[PDB]
Each structure stands twice: as C-alpha cells, then as structure tokens.
Design a binder for this molecule. Structure first.
Ligand SMILES: Nc1nc2c(ncn2[C@@H]2O[C@H](COP(=O)(O)OP(=O)(O)O)[C@@H](O)[C@H]2O)c(=O)[nH]1
Ligand SMILES: [Mg+2]
Length: 160
C-alpha cells in the first residue's frame, strides 16, 4: 500500500474533526474536543490502489511534509470562509509554491442557515485553481469525495 499525507485546516468549529471522524468511523460527533490535534490512519482502495491515508486534523512536520490540504470552511460561517485566504497563504509560504494539492471544502451543507453560496465558494476555488466540494459530516454527503479528490490532486501533482 501507498502512503498519502493529508492535512485538514480551517477555522475553529468548521467540522475538521467531524469530517475526519466521519471518514474513519462512519459516524457523526456533536462534541469533539476543539483542542485535540492528532493524526489518523485509514486504509482504503482509491481507483484500485490500496492507500494509507495519514491525516492530521489540526486544532490551531505535517505542514512541511503534508502532501495535500483540505481547506475547510462551514457554509453557515462567513468568517470561516473569509479565513480561507490565510490558511492558503500559510500553506503557500510553507511549500514556497502556488501549486499545492488542495481542495476547498464547504461543510455543514445539511444546515439551513446558509451564509456562503456555492457561487462564492466556486469563485474562490477557481481563483486558486482547486476543486470545491460541499460536505456534511453529519449526513456524510461529500466526505469520501473531498478526501478522494484530495488524493487524486496529489497524484496529479506528482508520481506516487
Ligand atoms: N449540522 C452539522 N454540524 C456539524 C457538521 N460538522 C461539524 N458540526 C458541528 O460543529 C461543531 C464543531 O465541529 P468540530 O468541527 O469537528 O470542529 P473543528 O474540528 O474545530 O473544525 C460540532 O458541534 C459538530 O457536531 C456538519 O456537517 N453538520
Ligand atoms: Mg476539532
């Protein structure tokens, strides 16, 4: 199997842990300690390649060595969306590159209180040249898609 090192970043409270816990446990957590920053492993077949996803769920070596970044905001949190820029500047600085495998994730899609429309998120991901994927860690909508798509963005950038 092949290792892929993934890093989930974004403002406090957006769903990094919930996304990460969904992917691995297939369940939704209401209350995950917002300070717990830790690495999780998951073995999964993605397009016939057995993959070991090594995932840092940041709380706020992986930044330097992480091969791909899920930049998460919550769609019912405008501030978190506006914050994306800073998470991106951080990763560009660390990698000394504008071409970092990256997906922009708009989480909490299940929630009715939408303050960031898909067109805004699409405008942002287009400026950056990255995919935008909408998720809900609660229903699991898009969660596999965000993580797989990040894997695929990593393969697009380098041989794995
Ligand atoms: N309804 C809903 N609540 C969510 C979702 N993701 C996270 N939450 C809630 O938002 C709070 C913060 O989640 P935790 O994100 O994982 O925050 P982070 O790890 O600091 O980004 C918790 O109460 C979660 O249950 C989601 O997709 N839908
Ligand atoms: Mg957390």
């Amino acid at each position: 199997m092949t290792e892929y090192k993934l890093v989930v970043v974004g403002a406090a409270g957006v769903g990094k842990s919930a996304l990460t816990i969904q992917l691995i446990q297939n369940h939704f957590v209401d209350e995950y300690d917002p300070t717990i920053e830790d690495s999780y492993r998951k073995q999964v077949v993605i397009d016939g390649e057995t993959c070991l996803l090594d995932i840092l769920d940041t709380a706020g070596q992986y930044m330097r060595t992480g091969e791909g970044f899920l930049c998460v905001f919550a769609i019912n949190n405008t501030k978190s969306f506006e914050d994306i820029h800073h998470y991106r500047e951080q990763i560009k600085r660390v990698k000394d590159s504008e071409d970092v495998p990256m997906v922009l994730v708009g989480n909490k899609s299940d929630l009715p209180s939408r303050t960031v429309d898909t067109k805004q998120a699409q405008d942002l991901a287009r400026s950056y040249g990255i995919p935008f994927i909408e998720t809900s860690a609660k229903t699991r909508q898009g969660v596999d898609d965000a993580f797989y798509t990040l894997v695929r963005e990593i393969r697009k950038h380098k041989e794995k």
